[PDB]
Write a protein that holds these residues in place. Structure first.
Motif, short mmCIF file in Angstrom:
data_model
loop_
_atom_site.label_atom_id
_atom_site.label_comp_id
_atom_site.label_asym_id
_atom_site.label_seq_id
_atom_site.Cartn_x
_atom_site.Cartn_y
_atom_site.Cartn_z
N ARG A 138 35.18 52.48 36.24
CA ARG A 138 36.60 52.72 35.98
C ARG A 138 37.48 51.84 36.87
N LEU A 139 37.02 51.62 38.10
CA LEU A 139 37.70 50.76 39.07
C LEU A 139 37.35 49.28 38.85
N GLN A 140 36.07 49.01 38.56
CA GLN A 140 35.51 47.66 38.44
C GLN A 140 36.23 46.78 37.41
N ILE A 141 36.44 47.32 36.21
CA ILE A 141 37.14 46.61 35.12
C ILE A 141 38.63 46.47 35.45
N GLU A 142 39.21 47.52 36.05
CA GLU A 142 40.63 47.57 36.40
C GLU A 142 41.01 46.63 37.55
N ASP A 143 40.08 46.40 38.47
CA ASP A 143 40.28 45.47 39.60
C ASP A 143 40.27 44.01 39.16
N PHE A 144 39.33 43.66 38.27
CA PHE A 144 39.23 42.31 37.70
C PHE A 144 40.31 42.02 36.66
N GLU A 145 40.92 43.08 36.13
CA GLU A 145 42.05 43.00 35.18
C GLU A 145 43.29 42.36 35.81
N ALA A 146 43.45 42.56 37.12
CA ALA A 146 44.56 42.02 37.91
C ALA A 146 44.63 40.49 37.90
N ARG A 147 43.47 39.83 37.89
CA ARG A 147 43.38 38.37 37.81
C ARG A 147 43.73 37.85 36.42
N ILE A 148 43.33 38.59 35.39
CA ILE A 148 43.60 38.25 33.98
C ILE A 148 45.09 38.44 33.66
N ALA A 149 45.67 39.53 34.18
CA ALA A 149 47.09 39.85 33.99
C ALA A 149 48.03 38.88 34.71
N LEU A 150 47.59 38.37 35.86
CA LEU A 150 48.38 37.43 36.66
C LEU A 150 47.97 35.97 36.43
N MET A 151 48.76 35.29 35.60
CA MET A 151 48.58 33.87 35.31
C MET A 151 49.55 32.93 36.07
#
Lengths: 56, 69
Positions: free
Chosen positions: B54-67
């Protein structure tokens, strides 16, 4: 406010194009093909009369 | 009367007897606790690992969201 949305799970990588800008697909870095390709011919060899060696 | 060293019997101290005896664990009983702790161990550990997802996908999502980064 209407300016709120939850991520839920994942982005899953979305594909959308609505600008293009001169298309832009073929550019790369290549300049030369270098003699295109080597010459190749297929006709199937018959038998060739006599061997190339000294004793035949 | 002459007084000397006197004898005492009563119980005679009880000489030569095995005082060593098995306690708590028998054999089959401890193995039920042993494997029982293992079965409780792996089941409780993997629930936290699923909670980590639940944390793992959400933590790596931050890099995808921030371009603009």
């Amino acid at each position: 406010k209407x300016x709120x949305x939850x991520x839920x799970x994942x982005x899953x990588x979305x594909x959308x194009x609505x600008x293009x800008x001169x298309x832009x697909x073929x550019x790369x870095x290549x300049x030369x093909x270098x003699x295109x390709x080597x010459x190749x011919x297929x006709x199937x060899x018959x038998x060739x009369x006599x061997x190339x060696x000294x004793x035949x | 009367x002459x007084x000397x060293x006197x004898x005492x019997x009563x119980x005679x101290x009880x000489x030569x007897x095995x005082x060593x005896x098995x306690x708590x664990x028998x054999g089959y009983s401890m193995f039920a606790v042993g494997i029982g702790a293992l079965l409780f161990g792996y089941w409780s550990m993997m629930k936290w690992n699923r909670e980590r997802r639940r944390l793992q996908i959400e933590d790596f999502e931050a890099r995808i969201a921030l371009m603009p980064l």
